[model samples]
Structures are given as C-alpha cells and as structure tokens.
Target: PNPYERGPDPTEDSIEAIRGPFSVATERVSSFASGFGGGTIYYPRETDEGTFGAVAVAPGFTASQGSMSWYGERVASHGFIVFTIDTNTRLDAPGQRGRQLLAALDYLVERSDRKVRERLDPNRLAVMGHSMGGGGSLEATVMRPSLKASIPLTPWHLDKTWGQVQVPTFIIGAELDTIAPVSTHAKPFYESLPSSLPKAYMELCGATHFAPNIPNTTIAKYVISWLKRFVDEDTRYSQFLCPNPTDRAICEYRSTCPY
Candidate 1:
C-alpha cells in the first residue's frame, strides 16, 4: 500500500495531502452494465508556478488509484498536476473508454478554480495506461480529437477505428504478454497513425504486461519525466518518450508492420 508505504514502495505520504478540499474532486462512475470507474487528482500547491502539466493515468481492469501511488508523487514533485482515473470498462464499452478518457481530462479542465481551468494548456497534455487501459488510451486519441499525446503500456488489440489516431503516441509493448499478444495486438492498427516522425513504438525485450509496471519506483521517474517533456514544456525529458536506441529499459525494433 503506497498510502501505507510497503514493499517495492516508490511513493511517500501524499495521498492525504492530495485528498483535502483544495485537492481535485474525483468521481467514481458505476453501472451494472459498465462496472466501476473512478478518477483521482492531486492539486499541487498551485501557488507554486505556471500551468502544471497533467498526466491522467488509466488503470487496468479491477485496478484503482492506490495502484498508482508509486508514480503519482513523481509527477507531483516534478511540478505537474497529477491524476489517476478508474475505468468503468468492459469489452462492450470499447469506444466508450475513449469517452471516459476525455471525461477525465475534462474534469480537470473544468474545475472551480479559474487557475486550474486556465492553466491547463490542452495543447500540452498527455494520457497513458496499462493492459486493457492501454487500448483505451489509443481509442481516446482516436475518438476525443483533443488529446495531444499518449503513452500506452502493454496495449491490448486495437479497435476497428484505431487507425484514426492523429496525435503523437508512445506505444510500450512487452515481448511476452499474453493479454494481447503483440503480434496480434499491434498488428491490426499499425497503419492508423502518422509514420513520419511524431509516432513511436517501443517493445521491451524480456518484459511482460506486468513488467513495465514493476520496479515501481523506476517507472515513477520515467513517467514523470515523459509527461514533463511534452506537457510541462520541458525538453529535458524528451528522451523519456523518444529514447535513443541505446537505452536499456526500452528496446528498439526497426521492423515496421507491413499492413
């Protein structure tokens, strides 16, 4: 428990600081047909600076805000407004997940404080997720048309409309994930987005769907840095998203899908 600080813990006690009245209000949406979906936010000591970069996290099935404690502070400490959303998702709401993603973004943009409202430069935001949530992120950019960038970790198979994504995306896939075998998961939508310069696909050589999420502390820094590069308008973390071929964490693959 990150709120409790247990094993492989990557976070500190910010949950309490993040839940007060000044903190952003998170809504938990539920339905017998759709299951349970919730969203969390940490309204950093805003009196601190310019528009804070926000990274909305979408957890996999049966996951929640506590599961994201590791990286939440990383983003907050780095000076970015942070959020981790619960997805009331299922196979039936394939496209709705994208709507949910946008809804999460909207929640932050539509806050009572004009500061929160005005500071969020929509052009400088990013969304990311894991497992089934990864697919939801992809579908979001394709459906929302408002998101600027994305990071989908260990994505599942693409939707029929997956090819419609226009924003820059950092796709992280594992070499051994069974949830959405890369060969099949990423193949169908390979041609959906731009092939020129803004898009990238990164596959971890020995990792699995659960691996990128492991060593929780490390991913915390990586995620914070990635969001900083794009949203916070910092170039220092540019490498976090589009890393050089030599980086150990993200293995490179030159072969393109021959759709």
Candidate 2:
C-alpha cells in the first residue's frame, strides 16, 4: 500500500465536533455470495463532485450486521459508502472474515451505477471491524495492499508480523477489555505496524470490548475524523489528529504522524 503523507497540520479543521454535511440513505442487501449473509449499505444521498471512498465493516464473533450498523450510519453520514456485513459462519477466523469483506466489496462495486459510481469510488476503499472481525480488517488490508486506510476495533489476531501491514491504520483498544486485552491484541497491532505509515492508537479508559458496539460521542468524533483525514484525503482533519481532542476524558490518543 502506498501511504498518503500529509505535510503539516491544518489550522482550520473543524469537522471533529459535529455531524457531516450530507443526508444518509441506508438499504438492505438481502444476500451475498449465496450462503454468506448480506448486510446494510449506508451512503450519502448527495456528495461533492468526484467519487467518494468506501468502507467495509465486519462484526465480531456471533455478531450480526445489525450489531455494527451504528458504524455504517455514522460513517455514511460523513459521506463514505459503508457496508456492515455478516459472514456465513459465525466463528470464522480473521482471514475468512477478511475474504467475506472483500466479497461484499466486489458486490458493491458491480452493483454501482453511474450516479453511484459518481458518488462512490471503488478504488478508494478501506476496511474496519471489531474484535475477531477487527483482526479481519487488518487481514483484508494485508490481502489488498492498495487499501487507503484501516481501523481495527479491539482486534484479536494470532500473528506478530502485522508490522508487514502496509496501509495507513488506526486502532482502538479498551483498557477493561479482558476478551481482547490491549496487551495481547490492540497495542501489539499498533506497535507492529510500520511507523513510516500514518498510524494512530486510541485506548478508552474503563471501557470493555462491548464498548465499541455502543454509541459514544467521543468514539464517533475520532472515527469520522480518521476517515475524513485518510479516506477523504481531507487535510482539515489534521488539526484534530495532532492537537488531539482534550474534550474527551474517556480516551487517550497517540499517533505516528507528527504532533
């Protein structure tokens, strides 16, 4: 993956605190690749000229598309095309879930129309997910080296060589998450990734593995800002990443980008 580097922090970045500039539209894709279950598609009803980026979000073990729908709605509200999908098997490993995510991306790319294509660019794709599925997001990034960015939420992966991961990435962790502790999972993923690439790590205080599934304003603020900064290539988000947000007491942030 070729990393898109930003030279300096923006002085006018104000998109971190509120909702985006577009109205969102969501629709169900009933089935995908025969047995693998389908999920929801969330996209902006209107967007600026040129194609918008897309993201595929996967849920954790035994988690359905509905469990991650909040990510879909919020990310889409910020103008990216989002697919929060389900795997055929509930207990699929990171690689399997990663393939399912790619399959979903293939479906979306094929079904896209002139208007859809105009708004959604297949090339500017990214991956994100939670827990096992979060590891899958990195796996997907590994599989597709051209991905613009990746955000793995409390990921659980067995590999130590995630340093080989070439995409710009952001990882979220939970201090109280026993299931996928920061020591064993999240922190390793962040540390293992290439420092030359744009990267960030965020850990929530007193939060557990289930915390990411629920709606929190602070989480949403960074999620949107991360996507805006990396996926949309919007420099306005640089200010939020560097100075960081002091408004949230629930989370702490660190980044490979210059502060």
Candidate 3:
C-alpha cells in the first residue's frame, strides 16, 4: 500500500541479486556539466511503474566516475534513478564533493534530459560516496537536511562530529582499512550522529578500503535495502536492516533498530 514503493515484493534472494526486477538503461552526461563533472545516468527502462526516487553517487579523492560506476545499474534496476558523477576535479575535498553531489542531483531534477526528468521523483532523493566522497555523502545530508538517506562507504573526513545531520544515514566500513581506519573515521562518524536519527554502521569482514570501489554482494544488498526503506519509504525492506545481518561478510553491524 505504500505509494512510493516501486518494485515487486521483497525477498531474501531478490535483494541480494545483482539485478532486480526492473530492466535498466543508461544516458551519458557531458563532462562539461554545470556544477560537477558529467558522468552517466542509469534508469529503469519502463515508465509505467511511475516516478522513481533518485540517488547521486560520487567517487573519493583522486578517483573518477569509473570507480563508482557499478552502483548506477546495480541500484537503478531495483527501481530508482542512479547518477554516478565525476567531481569537478579529481582532488576535490569532501566538502566540495558534497556540493557536487547536490549539484548533480539538481542537474538530475532540473537540467537532465526529458527521459530522465520525466521518470524522476525530485523530492525523493539520496546521496552516497566512497572515501572522501563518503565524507561528502555525510556533508551533503548536513548541507541539505531534506535528503532521505545517505550512505558513506569507508568515508574519510577531518571533522569527527556530525551532530547536525537530520537525514537517515548508513556508514559502511572496511575492517582492514588503513587509509581511513574504522576506529577513527567510520565509527566516530556513526557515533557522532544523534542517536535519535536513524543510523547504522556495518564493517565488512576482511575487506579493504577499496572493497566498495568494486562490486561486492554484501555492500550492494544493504545499500539497496537502506535506500528502499528510507528514500522509498517501503518498509518491506526493513526486515533486512532492523535485526542486523548475520552474513559472514559483515564483521560488525550496529544500528537504531525499529526504524
């Protein structure tokens, strides 16, 4: 009965699969973009399902759009518009990446082609990134409290505290990450978010900082659930999140359950 729900009934296997029920297609955006470097937009091929929520993803420092490309089709086919964007510059800081994430969302809702804009639900949107881009995901939520969800993969940021963020956030960390240790980066970031806010932290067992950059089943499944639960307000996906996952890939999982 949820008006925002987009896909078929949720199932354990479906959420974990590489492709969801909806077929996907892509549209390339020019690098000469308005606020961020252009990348590509992955969307569902069918329009009859109604407007889908959207998510804008960014790469970490010194990373390119290719680093985050897998998420585009992986998430879009599940019934959403996914934009994997390049920053204005490779070395842009997290704050700058945060702005670019917002800019990319703006481009999606305002300047994107008719095919993309027509199928998008502008109000239902989210942000995600890796490393500093992950930090950017946190920054984007603070910059825009209206964001429905945020996922920061092995995020790195100088500031440890995020007391002002109002959006629901999910932070994924790598247990063996030396670049951005979970103890200092991901853990503190999650602890700093107000306990009243819907938040969760999952550390990948035996994984490295670069794990998110590649396609991993653990990361993909949870990412989809969080987006579906928050952005789409579809509680069918909540079962995957509330009880905490027992998958061997996850070393640790923490959250404000019953959200």
Candidate 4:
C-alpha cells in the first residue's frame, strides 16, 4: 500500500470530476510574505488521511492569483495542500517566479498556520504555473530537483532547453497559442528534457493561450493524475496517463509512458 496515497481508489470519472473526495478548507497568506506575494492555501479539512503532499502554483506574467484560484479547491479536495500564489510582482520573469514558487513551498512547510503546516508533508512537494509561470515551474524543478512533480500550463519561456530537470514533469500546451507558440516553447521544452526523465506533453485542441487561465476539464484531470502519480507515488492513477488520452479536447499527446 502507498503510504502517501490519500482519498479513495481511482476511477475514470473520479479523476476527471470537478472535485475529489476530501472536504476542503482554506487559509489566506498575507501579500507581505517574504520572497513572494501571498495568496491562499487550500487544504483537506480531515486529519484521518495523514499528511498530504503539497503543490505551489504560480500565475503567468501580468496575471494574479485570482487567475489561478480555481486550482486551489479543485486540487486540494483531492487530498493535497494546494497553494495558489501571487508573484512578487506582476511583471516578474519566469526565474523570479520559480524562486517565488520555492519560497511558497517553504512558507507552507515552515511559516504557514498550524492548519496548513500540520497537514503538510514537506518532503513530498510539487510546483505548477501558467504561461511564464509554467516556465517557472520548469525552473523550480531545476532549482529543487527534490520536487516530486511539475505541471507547466501553456508555459512560455525564452529558454528552449531544459536538459537538467530531474523531476517528473507534465507540460500542457494550447493548440492555437500565438503568445508562446508550441513549436518554439512548449514542444521544444518538452523535447529538451532528458528522455530518461518521466515526462508528458498534452496540447488542447482548438484552445488558446488563455485556455489555461479558465476552468479546463482536460487540464484539471491530467494535472491531478500527474501530481498523484509522482507526488503520491500512486500507480493507480497511471492508467489515465500511460495509454495517452484520446479525448476530443486533446489535439496531441506525447510521453515516456508506463511511468
């Protein structure tokens, strides 16, 4: 049995649902937080599940925590502590966003309130972001290879090569994104990662760069699956990832499967 696994057994519908089994509660972090702009921490209300893995999420350039707020309850309800954060500044680049993500995780493990700190498993952590924040997620993994998982949603970064990342990463891209064209950004970044590393790339069909900014079922389902498989080390969710999804929402999918 997986010690880190939380919530119920996996099912196709369960992983894809808007919310998971656990009830959620939230704590607000002050904007004056050191290293990053403060946001909210969403956690499971019940203590019966033991400690839950946590994830720090960052918004894209020019975006605020509100843009990524939907992920907090949506993911935390599935049995993890989710911190959707604001950057130190709205114009901060991906590298700065990456540092802020790490800072957010540290705050969760160290400075956060008892309600959040007590339920967190500091060793089991992850990072995610949108647009440039997505790029920051990649940067965070390199900065802290100890991270279990990373999901970069429609990520945009100037650096094309990420050969040093050690964490299991899932990159989600938009099919019609002009802001950060997949050919130059997402695809290259995915391909640039070491093939030996556990990774996957999924492109939303007919979607724009802003697609990740809103509630997206395809993005939600896969993000949960990746975090569950890597952070929780739960293989039960592997079924949803290995074969490659055939959902009409996906324009294309790629991965080093059977992870």
Give the candidate number with the greatest lDDT: 3
- Residue-wise C-alpha lDDT for candidate 4, range 1-259, written one tens digit per residue: 7898888788889878889999999998885255467888999998896999999998885544328889999999899999988544574589988888898898888788988888999999999998888999999999999999999998989999999999999999999999989999999999999999999999999998888777788898999999999999988899999999888999899999978
Worst 10 residues of 2 by lDDT: 1-10
RMSD of 4: 1.5
Whole-structure CA lDDT of model 2: 0.75
Cα deviation of 112 in candidate 4 (Å)?
0.6
lDDT of all the models against the reference?
0.54, 0.75, 0.90, 0.89
Residue pairs with clashing backbones, model 4: none
Q: What ranges in model 2 sit over 4 Å off?
A: 1-18, 64-66, 87-89, 112-115
Query: Candidate 3 — which residues are off by over 4 angstroms?
Result: 63-66
**Which pairs clash (backbone N, Cα, C closer than 3 Å) in model 3?**
none
| Full candidate order by lDDT, most accurate first | 3, 4, 2, 1
Give, for candidate 4, the lowest lDDT window spanning 10 residues: 60-69
Candidate 2: count the clashes.
Answer: 0
Q: Which digits, one per residue and each the tens of the lDDT, describe model 3 over residues 75-103?
A: 99899999987544574588988898898
Which parts of model 1 are misplaced by more than 4 Å? 1-36, 63-66, 87-92, 112-119, 158-161, 187-192, 212-218, 239-245, 253-259
RMSD of each: 8.4, 4.1, 1.5, 1.5
Better of 1 and 2 by lDDT: 2
